[PDB]
Design a protein around this ligand. Structure first.
Ligand SMILES: Nc1ncnc2c1ncn2[C@@H]1O[C@H](COP(=O)(O)OP(=O)(O)NP(=O)(O)O)[C@@H](O)[C@H]1O
Ligand SMILES: Nc1ncnc2c1ncn2[C@@H]1O[C@H](COP(=O)(O)OP(=O)(O)NP(=O)(O)O)[C@@H](O)[C@H]1O
Ligand SMILES: [Mg+2]
Ligand SMILES: [Mg+2]
Lengths: 289, 242, 289, 242
């Protein structure tokens, strides 16, 4: 029914890999050891799935996965997390991604949670990109209570690499969001974009540390950060830019706090009240609209 | 003046708007009548934008002297939402970009109650508005009204929003600039469509050629309405005096 | 000849204060203790001077100054540093500035140095701004070798305060630039702008940590950072934004690395070569043009 | 075509410019003769800007097929500086903002050798250029060409830069838009001044009314030059065909 990896609770339900896509999987009692290998030349344009369901109390879904893409290969992974019960849950993913010469990896993770915030989603992703490689990452947590999010990524890029990382979050109640991403452009003409979008309300706490190192000639980077603050929410944005080459250029733009006055006034000129206009901007910000 | 007020939609009386220590508008007397396309011409820095923002009630554009009466009510204490709920709306010149708002959902915002009600009628009104501003509906309906669009596409979508809204008063800040207009016949086709529906347009422009297609024209020079009336008479005065 | 404070070497040469402007000064052998008090209602529109000259080898010019501005007062201070010999020099300034209700303080410091980089300019400035107060600060070091710059500022602002801080630097040879500024908008409608401009060449090292905390309703802040990188220079920009109110808004924009392509191509369209065009952008960036 | 090349300043032969997977210019044949104001009309997205950047040699705007000959030399291997040293310059549409560059120093960049030499003559040429674009020299000489200026002020300063430069070929991307033009008599006064000096202008515009004041007009539709010649004949075709 499609090349997928199903994990219900802390057990592997299914491990099936097609021609040119080696999917290994084993369990060390609670710890899942996966290894995905995309063979040289295999460009699969149809997306692979990875479902994670948690309905039991006190589950520690720890998954160590290694994704290797050989020269000229291509794969898109669509991870889905459904945690509706949310009591004592802990989804921890530790990944090592190695993208070969002229290979392309794309990752999209969506979360659907319940209204109780005793969930801890903790992805740690190390990415190594070879000459001509491409990495696209998208993490979206806008459904239910996030609980505590702790994303950590470190990407190392060589000659002509392309990186596009995006985060869309909607923090409510006493949610905690922690995002720490570092991209090192270590090869000639390596390009990167880190985009963060989100809204924080009630008593949520956000910390976004996004970093780009422009270490080689013609390497370009751009950090775009935007986070709306409502209620007693607290946001901290720390966008570090390091440049170690005279032909490298990195730019960053960020807007934290209340919604833009012109955007609010443009929607209020359509007859919408301050609350309806803010809700529209926030819904569009988190990808609902 | 309180003579012929029964046919007046908007009435700006001796308006003084200050932006810090500078007085931008120094006594603006301007009226907009029902079913009228009233254009406002003037050089750069004359206060065309300032006047448009003061009527709409934009924060910071607060009058010190003078009053703005809309539909017989002095809107001195009415906010942007309250003025928009009376039937007044604004274009901007540089329409704001929005994160994650599709064209199909953006054109529904503020939509007239005569379209907004029926689902199949509201969805058809969007297509009619996008086709009027020379945009292919199927190519733009699922596009975001964000930075991704060109200035011409975003201003044309703002013109389509005015069409879906069908306001009693539509203040249009430079509707022909920012779209890189091919010919006035394309903007006239939109202006006449709104006029046939019963709308009044307060078209703000620097182009004397655009103002000749309006019913009445007022010349604003350094925050004051110098000449007003026939578009060609006040246009001939604009070519000579500054 | 004008209300001024002259310091040649590590000794006070002159200490003269006019009506409504109390200028106290004393020496504790190497350490200079100054205290400037602007009286309530005194708005001096003509700028006060503060000259610092160092021509001797191994001079440790340590000055502890306290500047107090009473309700509705106004003063502008123009500090001038001339260190042409530059061998073993150390100019250290530790200041406490307290701006009263509806008071206005403006500070402009310019440096003229020689071609030897054994100079250490170390200003540490704590600023406390009351309801309606104004603080304007400008540090410019674009003449000769900077040596080692270590600026540290912490500004606390109350209701309706206005802060404008600017830094223009030109780092050459083995220069080190360190700028650490924090602005806390702790009162309703307090506004702030931190602007950094500069160019780093040869083997220079720049570290710019600029921070704004939007802790009260209607407080606004903007960080604008721009730093050109040429040769083997290294730049690190860390612009922190903290927002603790739903009616507060802070934005930040930064551009680090090589000059903008459109700006370079616009000047090259005027017949200027890549080096002449870059030199023009860099000269304009550091305030020479 | 190599007939009448002795009176040709610029010659674009079957030019194909690609921007990634898309081909923007699909065989552009265009020539600019000596002392000619040659206008280029076309709708939005026709490749007007792309063509202007390819002639100037802007990075990324590299032709795949076809050649650009300027002053009898194929400039295929010449960079922006080398093309500018031949006497060719560009306007942009949105002239770049510069940190810390005063108007008085900006107008000196690229200034013609006939003014640049004498100090009192170069300083007077700046005043003449600013007075021509309706800017008060004393109000703008010590202003920075940064974000602080309005779009109209910065584009007028770009027009004054063209005047001080007095190039053999001046490519002007939308000179009348961005200044919110009051009347064509003000832009015509600048165009005629450059023409009297011996300049050739390659005016890129979407406004058919502006093109009628040029000597020759070429209509670009989807990267191809459809009709060319008399400004009124090709203008009548632009009103009907798209
Ligand atoms: N952000 C601002 N800061 C300072 N002054 C401003 C600002 N916005 C507008 N003004 C002032 O407003 C006046 C210009 O009025 P406005 O109506 O915006 O222009 P206009 O005549 O319509 N020209 P245009 O904007 O080209 O259509 C001038 O006196 C400006 O100084
Ligand atoms: N940054 C870009 N990214 C993608 N496509 C681009 C970009 N810049 C230009 N194009 C393409 O260039 C073409 C437009 O050509 P251009 O000459 O810029 O426009 P135009 O007809 O002059 N209109 P205008 O810009 O309003 O004057 C389209 O096919 C665009 O897709
Ligand atoms: Mg305007
Ligand atoms: Mg263009």
């Amino acid at each position: 029914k499609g090349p997928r990896i199903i994990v219900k609770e802390s057990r592997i339900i299914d491990v099936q890999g097609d021609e040119g896509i080696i999917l290994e999987g084993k369990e060390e009692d609670g710890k899942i050891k996966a290894k995905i290998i995309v063979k040289k030349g295999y460009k699969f344009k149809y997306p692979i799935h990875m479902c994670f369901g948690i309905t039991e109390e006190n589950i520690s879904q720890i998954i160590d996965v290694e994704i290797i893409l050989e020269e000229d290969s291509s794969i898109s992974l669509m991870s889905h997390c459904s945690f509706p019960k949310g009591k004592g849950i802990k989804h921890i993913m530790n990944g090592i991604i190695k993208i070969g010469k002229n290979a392309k990896f794309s990752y999209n993770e969506f979360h659907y949670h319940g209204m109780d915030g005793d969930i801890l989603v903790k992805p740690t992703v190390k990415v190594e990109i070879d000459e001509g490689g491409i990495y696209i990452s998208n993490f979206t947590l806008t459904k239910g209570r996030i609980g505590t999010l702790d994303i950590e990524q470190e990407i190392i890029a060589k000659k002509d690499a392309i990186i596009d990382i995006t985060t869309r979050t909607y923090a409510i109640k006493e949610d905690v969001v922690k995002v720490n991403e570092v991209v090192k452009l270590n090869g000639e003409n390596a390009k990167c974009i880190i985009k963060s979008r989100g809204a924080a309300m009630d008593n949520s706490k956000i910390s976004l540390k996004l970093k780009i190192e422009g270490n080689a000639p013609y390497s370009k980077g751009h950090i775009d950060c935007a986070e709306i603050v409502k209620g007693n929410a607290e946001v901290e944005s720390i966008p570090i830019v390091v440049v170690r080459d005279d032909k490298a250029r990195i730019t960053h733009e960020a807007a934290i706090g209340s919604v833009d006055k012109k955007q609010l006034e443009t929607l209020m000129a359509k007859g919408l009240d301050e609350d309806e206009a803010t809700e529209i901007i926030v819904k569009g910000m988190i990808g609902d609209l | 003046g309180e003579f012929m007020v029964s046919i007046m939609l908007l009435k700006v009386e001796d308006l003084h708007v200050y932006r810090g220590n500078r007085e931008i508008l120094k006594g603006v007397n301007l009226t907009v009548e029902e079913n009228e396309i009233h254009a406002i011409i003037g050089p750069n820095g004359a206060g065309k934008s300032t006047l448009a923002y003061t009527i709409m009630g934009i924060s910071g554009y607060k009058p010190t002297k003078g009053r703005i009466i809309f539909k017989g009510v002095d809107i001195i204490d009415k906010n942007i939402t309250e003025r928009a709920r009376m039937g007044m709306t604004l274009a901007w010149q540089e329409p704001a970009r929005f994160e994650g708002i599709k064209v199909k959902n953006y054109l529904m915002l503020g939509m007239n109650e005569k379209y907004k009600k029926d689902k199949e009628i509201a969805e058809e009104k969007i297509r009619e508005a996008l086709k009027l501003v020379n945009l292919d509906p199927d190519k733009y309906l699922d596009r975001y009204v964000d930075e991704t669009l060109s200035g011409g596409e975003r201003k044309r979508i703002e013109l389509a929003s005015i069409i879906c809204m069908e306001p009693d008063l539509a203040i249009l800040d430079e509707p022909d600039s920012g779209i890189d207009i091919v010919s006035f016949d394309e903007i006239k086709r939109v202006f006449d469509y709104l006029k046939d529906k019963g709308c009044s347009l307060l078209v703000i422009t620097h182009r004397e050629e655009l103002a000749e297609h309006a019913d009445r024209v007022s010349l604003i020079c350094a925050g004051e309405v110098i000449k007003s009336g026939d578009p060609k008479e006040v246009g001939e005065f604009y070519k000579k005096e500054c």
